[PDB]
Amino acid sequence: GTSKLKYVLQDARFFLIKSNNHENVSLAKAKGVWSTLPVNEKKLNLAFRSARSVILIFSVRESGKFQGFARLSSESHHGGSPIHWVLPSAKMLGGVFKIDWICRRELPFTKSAHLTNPWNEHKPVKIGRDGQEIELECGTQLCLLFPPDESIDLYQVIHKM
Numbered sequence: 001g002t003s004k005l006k007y008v009l010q011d012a013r014f015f016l017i018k019s020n021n022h023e024n025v026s027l028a029k030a031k032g033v034w035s036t037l038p039v040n041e042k043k044l045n046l047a048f049r050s051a052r053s054v055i056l057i058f059s060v061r062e063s064g065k066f067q068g069f070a071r072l073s074s075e076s077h078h079g080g081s082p083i084h085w086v087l088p089s090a091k092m093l094g095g096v097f098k099i100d101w102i103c104r105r106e107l108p109f110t111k112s113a114h115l116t117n118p119w120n121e122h123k124p125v126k127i128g129r130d131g132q133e134i135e136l137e138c139g140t141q142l143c144l145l146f147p148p149d150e151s152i153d154l155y156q157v158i159h160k161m
């Protein structure tokens, strides 16, 4: 069902993540981590302290789709490991956030054409730069459009909250 998902999304904040390649999204799905540029790392660290859930909604550039969404489980941390990101430098991708995936399924942009983002001039929610915040109502509805991911149990995510 969608009840636990709605509970996780309650009062959440949402950010669009735009990746240049599929490989880093695949690596993020396998290892539960994400890294971004310092402008956005600063924004996400602020958001993580400010909200019960911070949701990253991923889209690979030129794919015409979102590739899923995940909840931040930590602020960014340095050292830890050298993630083999297919770097589009490595020093700008230090700072690793831990993330718990909520949905690893794809959603085509054609399915979100009815959703506009107030924080980006009411452009369709697919439009935005890496790090663009998505207002609560639009982000909630976007996440609810994804196909359910029955391989994921939200019970442990609710306990992180």
Ligand SMILES: CNc1nc(Cl)nc2c1ncn2Cc1ccccc1N
Pocket (backbone or CB within 6 Å): 018, 019, 020, 021, 024, 034, 035, 036, 037, 085, 086, 087, 088, 093, 130
């Ligand atoms: C693992 N993290 C990332 N991996 C990839 Cl392949 N692209 C990213 C990532 N974070 C942001 N972008 C998009 C981008 C690429 C290059 C210059 C500026 C911007 N915004």
